[PDB]
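Handout, section 4.2: multi-component inputs.
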Amino acid sequence: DILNEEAKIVQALNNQRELTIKMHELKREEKDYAHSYSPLFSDPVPQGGSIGKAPGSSR
Amino acid sequence: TAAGISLTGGRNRCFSEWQSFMHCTAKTDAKSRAQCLPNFEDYMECLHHTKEKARLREIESVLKQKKEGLEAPPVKVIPVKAIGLV
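Output:
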């Protein structure tokens, strides 16, 4: 009855160790432009400055 | 903001190279931006014309070494009151 209450605590601490190692991996994972910039307007493509615009300036 | 707005409100001189680089970075995740190098190189030398000035001094150093100099259809300079003279 004491070895099982050992193993419960050790299971509950290896759960926290794996929880930390996961949450440290989750930080260095790269993130989408829709999550790490504005959600609305998910493109990085500008089309900026359109009053005297020349066709052929797009690429 | 005013990312690519020119003096007349249009697009600036290096907008097309910048928008091409932004096309390159839009479809591309990190650890694979090494292919996105030539678009950036094109943009930076659109801005500052470094490779262009390098090429022009490489050909100007040869131009002063010839005694013949110029055997080509030449470029004629005009004064400002003589745009359409002849």
